[PDB]
From Swiss-Prot, chain B:
Free-text function comment from the UniProt entry: Toxic component of a type II toxin-antitoxin (TA) system. Upon expression in E.coli and M.smegmatis inhibits cell growth and colony formation. Its toxic effect is neutralized by coexpression with cognate antitoxin MazE7. Probably an endoribonuclease.
Name this protein carries in UniProt: Probable endoribonuclease MazF7
Source species of the chain: Mycobacterium tuberculosis (strain ATCC 25618 / H37Rv)
Section of the entire sequence shown: 1 to 114 of 136
Family: Belongs to the PemK/MazF family.
Keyword Hydrolase included in the entry's annotation: yes
Length: 105, 106
């Protein structure tokens, strides 16, 4: 459990694709089977209020968007390597989109 | 089949099967099968914790069942194969709180 919230990580599924860690750091115990919640990042989908943009300086090879509607818990073991970290503004956009999607106060 | 609604409890295919709570909002649904619905899986083999609030048989599941909010995930609508029930509003508020913690939301 080297992933951190706000990090951008390469995820297994054979394909590897990037995703942003959104679960909080104090959940991690360092075992492979534990669940980490990530938001997939795609460079082939257009930008919307629920798909905020992610820049190459944050770890992707090309202009990407965070598909917050595709949020999912994956096993630690599926996180293959660290790619970068997101700017705090991008994290606030993802938090807002996610607040909308899940109907939270 | 019916359109899933927030707070509904649905059976999810993956062949294994498991109940889950719909947590995404209703205005995201456009009526196509491939569109993503965010659910919280329900388990009867995990103990209760502040992140695994209990779900009562009156809400559609077996006794001693918990909402594994840490297992939240988007699945295709088509994987929601049978409507099972609905949650009491207090249980939905517990799940909202747990999700707010897990995802670090304001």
């Amino acid at each position: 459990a080297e992933p951190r919230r706000g990090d951008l990580w390469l995820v297994s599924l054979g394909k590897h694709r990037p995703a942003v860690v959104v679960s909080v750091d104090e959940l991690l115990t360092g075992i492979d089977d534990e669940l980490v919640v990530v938001v997939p990042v795609s460079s082939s989908r257009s930008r919307t209020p629920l798909r905020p943009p992610v820049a190459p300086s944050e770890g992707v090879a090309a202009d990407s968007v965070a598909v917050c509607r595709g949020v999912r818990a994956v096993a630690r073991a599926r996180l293959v390597e660290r790619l970068g970290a997101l700017k705090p503004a991008t994290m606030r956009a993802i938090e807002n989109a996610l607040t909308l999607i899940l109907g939270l106060p």
